[PDB]
Design an enzyme around this catalytic site. Structure first.
Site, PDB file in Angstrom:
ATOM      1  N   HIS A 107     -59.753 -35.059 -36.654  1.00 51.70           N
ATOM      2  CA  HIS A 107     -58.528 -34.371 -37.046  1.00 51.70           C
ATOM      3  C   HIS A 107     -58.834 -32.963 -37.535  1.00 51.70           C
ATOM      4  O   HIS A 107     -58.090 -32.024 -37.237  1.00 51.70           O
ATOM      5  CB  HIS A 107     -57.779 -35.167 -38.123  1.00 51.70           C
ATOM      6  CG  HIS A 107     -57.410 -36.559 -37.698  1.00 51.70           C
ATOM      7  ND1 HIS A 107     -57.004 -37.526 -38.590  1.00 51.70           N
ATOM      8  CD2 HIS A 107     -57.378 -37.142 -36.474  1.00 51.70           C
ATOM      9  CE1 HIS A 107     -56.754 -38.651 -37.939  1.00 51.70           C
ATOM     10  NE2 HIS A 107     -56.978 -38.447 -36.653  1.00 51.70           N
TER      11      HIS A 107
ATOM     12  N   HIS B 145     -50.022 -37.827 -31.736  1.00 50.55           N
ATOM     13  CA  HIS B 145     -51.278 -37.939 -32.466  1.00 50.55           C
ATOM     14  C   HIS B 145     -52.442 -38.192 -31.514  1.00 50.55           C
ATOM     15  O   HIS B 145     -53.555 -37.695 -31.738  1.00 50.55           O
ATOM     16  CB  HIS B 145     -51.219 -39.040 -33.528  1.00 50.55           C
ATOM     17  CG  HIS B 145     -52.480 -39.110 -34.321  1.00 50.55           C
ATOM     18  ND1 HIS B 145     -52.730 -38.265 -35.376  1.00 50.55           N
ATOM     19  CD2 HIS B 145     -53.611 -39.838 -34.141  1.00 50.55           C
ATOM     20  CE1 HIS B 145     -53.944 -38.500 -35.847  1.00 50.55           C
ATOM     21  NE2 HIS B 145     -54.504 -39.441 -35.108  1.00 50.55           N
TER      22      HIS B 145
ATOM     23  N   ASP C  55     -55.884 -36.101 -31.453  1.00 46.29           N
ATOM     24  CA  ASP C  55     -57.232 -36.675 -31.394  1.00 46.29           C
ATOM     25  C   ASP C  55     -57.995 -36.175 -30.180  1.00 46.29           C
ATOM     26  O   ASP C  55     -59.194 -35.884 -30.262  1.00 46.29           O
ATOM     27  CB  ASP C  55     -57.173 -38.212 -31.345  1.00 46.29           C
ATOM     28  CG  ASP C  55     -56.904 -38.840 -32.700  1.00 46.29           C
ATOM     29  OD1 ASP C  55     -57.030 -38.148 -33.737  1.00 46.29           O
ATOM     30  OD2 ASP C  55     -56.551 -40.047 -32.721  1.00 46.29           O
TER      31      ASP C  55
ATOM     32  N   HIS D  83     -61.570 -42.323 -28.668  1.00 46.37           N
ATOM     33  CA  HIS D  83     -62.746 -41.515 -28.976  1.00 46.37           C
ATOM     34  C   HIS D  83     -63.909 -41.858 -28.066  1.00 46.37           C
ATOM     35  O   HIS D  83     -64.617 -40.963 -27.600  1.00 46.37           O
ATOM     36  CB  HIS D  83     -63.144 -41.682 -30.437  1.00 46.37           C
ATOM     37  CG  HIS D  83     -62.005 -41.453 -31.374  1.00 46.37           C
ATOM     38  ND1 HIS D  83     -61.290 -40.272 -31.387  1.00 46.37           N
ATOM     39  CD2 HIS D  83     -61.424 -42.263 -32.288  1.00 46.37           C
ATOM     40  CE1 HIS D  83     -60.331 -40.358 -32.294  1.00 46.37           C
ATOM     41  NE2 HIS D  83     -60.389 -41.555 -32.853  1.00 46.37           N
TER      42      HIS D  83
HETATM   43  C1  LIG Z   1     -54.384 -44.114 -34.178  1.00 42.43           C
HETATM   44  C2  LIG Z   1     -55.896 -44.360 -33.987  1.00 42.43           C
HETATM   45  C3  LIG Z   1     -56.350 -43.626 -32.723  1.00 42.43           C
HETATM   46  C4  LIG Z   1     -56.715 -43.862 -35.204  1.00 42.43           C
HETATM   47  N1  LIG Z   1     -56.415 -44.517 -36.443  1.00 42.43           N
HETATM   48  C5  LIG Z   1     -57.231 -45.410 -37.206  1.00 42.43           C
HETATM   49  O1  LIG Z   1     -58.327 -45.726 -36.899  1.00 42.43           O
HETATM   50  C6  LIG Z   1     -56.526 -45.944 -38.438  1.00 42.43           C
HETATM   51  C7  LIG Z   1     -56.954 -47.107 -39.034  1.00 42.43           C
HETATM   52  C8  LIG Z   1     -56.280 -47.581 -40.147  1.00 42.43           C
HETATM   53  C9  LIG Z   1     -55.187 -46.899 -40.629  1.00 42.43           C
HETATM   54  C10 LIG Z   1     -54.462 -47.420 -41.842  1.00 42.43           C
HETATM   55  C11 LIG Z   1     -53.891 -47.835 -42.772  1.00 42.43           C
HETATM   56  C12 LIG Z   1     -53.138 -48.485 -43.907  1.00 42.43           C
HETATM   57  C13 LIG Z   1     -52.564 -48.975 -44.800  1.00 42.43           C
HETATM   58  C14 LIG Z   1     -51.821 -49.610 -45.960  1.00 42.43           C
HETATM   59  C15 LIG Z   1     -51.263 -50.958 -45.514  1.00 42.43           C
HETATM   60  O2  LIG Z   1     -52.113 -51.938 -46.041  1.00 42.43           O
HETATM   61  C16 LIG Z   1     -54.739 -45.746 -40.019  1.00 42.43           C
HETATM   62  C17 LIG Z   1     -55.412 -45.275 -38.917  1.00 42.43           C
HETATM   63  C18 LIG Z   1     -57.123 -42.391 -35.243  1.00 42.43           C
HETATM   64  O3  LIG Z   1     -56.253 -41.651 -35.568  1.00 42.43           O
HETATM   65  N2  LIG Z   1     -58.435 -41.874 -34.924  1.00 42.43           N
HETATM   66  O4  LIG Z   1     -58.580 -40.685 -34.992  1.00 42.43           O
HETATM   67  S1  LIG Z   1     -56.041 -46.148 -33.635  1.00 42.43           S
HETATM   68  O5  LIG Z   1     -57.376 -46.454 -33.118  1.00 42.43           O
HETATM   69  O6  LIG Z   1     -55.193 -46.477 -32.491  1.00 42.43           O
HETATM   70  C19 LIG Z   1     -55.565 -47.172 -35.058  1.00 42.43           C
HETATM   71  C20 LIG Z   1     -55.339 -48.621 -34.604  1.00 42.43           C
HETATM   72  C21 LIG Z   1     -55.208 -49.565 -35.720  1.00 42.43           C
HETATM   73  O7  LIG Z   1     -53.830 -49.853 -35.319  1.00 42.43           O
HETATM   74  C22 LIG Z   1     -53.964 -48.916 -34.201  1.00 42.43           C
HETATM   75 MG   LIG Z   2     -56.624 -39.715 -35.043  1.00 39.19          MG
END
Ligand SMILES: CC(C)([C@H](NC(=O)c1ccc(C#CC#CCCO)cc1)C(=O)NO)S(=O)(=O)CC1COC1
Ligand SMILES: [Mg+2]
Length: 303
Positions: free
Chosen positions: A83, A241, A245, A268
């Site tokens: 990010h 988003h 990424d 990724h």
């Molecule tokens: C979108 C992605 C590409 C990615 N996000 C993550 O890893 C991630 C993990 C946990 C959380 C959280 C939380 C919470 C809470 C409170 C409640 O208890 C946010 C984000 C990314 O932005 N990478 O840059 S993802 O892989 O699709 C993420 C999956 C997992 O579902 C879809």
């Molecule tokens: Mg991301």
């Protein structure tokens, strides 16, 4: 006077300081962005270690690409660079030192918004050297199962992405295309937050991941709806988003791209596989500069 002006490399004008939490580690982390000399690139510096360990943000240094993009050197890692790197790429920053007091970049609000605000408040500095671009000259494609990531020649910079989640929250196109030689990264994409589904967040926590996640830094989705009480920033925030990424992961090339990226369920890991295949296929790209900004296919905000 009036005449051709080279597109120049850019660094920070002033230092930026921020404090936050790692999305996956939950650790408190102090971030300092510093200007850097021409041709430095973006370099991450673990200042909690003695000696300081410095890791250039380049494809060759990518370790695991599981939940986030991670840089590795020996036993030292910098986690979740995507990010912040997206913000650097989107604002045209060539050279900077990123000092971190812990292994993971702070998550901020889950998007690139806070980074672009902090950087643009500090301001940018053009430097006395031509900016180098990597121009795609052949189509390059990597697939794994039903996931795909591709570079295509394009006189500009454009990113398209499609996701395919079978989930009531998308009952939406799950597809977006953005042309950044035309629209603005800050406008179109920078504010799109990361997201997670409760079912996966629960698994992640059981594996000591997502320890810092919450509604304050992520879109949280249960089996039917977004739990964040104040909703979404964009109707297509999820796929926006994914584009954010992708822009960050692509900046591990070390230079801005002249080309088109198309992602289908990519992430990724596949993104970095695409970069490694591109780098190896030297017939598919070349490094170019632009001696007259007026004839270049890409332009940048005032610094
Ligand atoms: C979108 C992605 C590409 C990615 N996000 C993550 O890893 C991630 C993990 C946990 C959380 C959280 C939380 C919470 C809470 C409170 C409640 O208890 C946010 C984000 C990314 O932005 N990478 O840059 S993802 O892989 O699709 C993420 C999956 C997992 O579902 C879809
Ligand atoms: Mg991301």
């Amino acid at each position: 006077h009036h005449h051709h002006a080279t597109i120049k490399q850019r660094t920070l004008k002033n230092i930026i300081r921020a404090t936050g939490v790692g999305l996956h580690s939950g650790e408190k982390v102090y971030l300092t962005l510093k200007p850097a000399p021409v041709d430095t690139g973006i370099v991450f510096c673990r200042t909690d270690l003695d000696p300081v360990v410095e890791i250039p943000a380049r494809a060759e240094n990518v370790g695991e690409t599981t939940m986030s993009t991670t840089l590795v050197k020996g036993d030292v890692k910098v986690d979740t660079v995507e990010h912040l790197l997206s913000a650097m790429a989107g604002l045209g920053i060539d050279n900077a030192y990123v000092e971190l007091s812990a292994s993971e970049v702070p998550i901020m609000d889950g998007s690139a918004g806070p980074f672009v605000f902090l950087i643009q408040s500090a301001g940018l500095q053009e430097q006395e050297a031509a900016k180098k671009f990597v121009r795609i000259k052949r189509e390059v494609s990597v697939e794994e199962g039903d996931k795909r990531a591709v570079f295509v020649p394009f006189d500009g910079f454009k990113v398209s992405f499609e996701i395919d989640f079978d989930h009531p929250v998308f009952r939406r196109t799950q597809q977006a295309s953005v042309d950044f030689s035309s629209t603005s990264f800050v406008k179109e994409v920078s504010r799109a937050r990361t997201f997670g589904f409760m079912r996966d967040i629960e698994y992640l926590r059981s594996q000591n991941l997502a320890l810092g996640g919450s509604v304050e830094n992520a879109i949280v989705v249960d089996e039917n709806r977004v739990l964040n009480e104040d909703g979404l920033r964009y109707e297509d925030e999820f796929v926006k988003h994914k584009i954010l990424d992708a822009i960050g992961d692509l900046y591990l090339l070390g230079n801005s791209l002249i080309g088109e990226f198309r992602g289908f369920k990519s992430g990724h890991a596949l993104n970095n596989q695409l970069l490694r295949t591109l780098i190896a296929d030297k017939d598919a790209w070349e490094v170019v500069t632009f001696e007259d900004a007026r004839t270049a296919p890409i332009s940048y905000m005032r610094p």
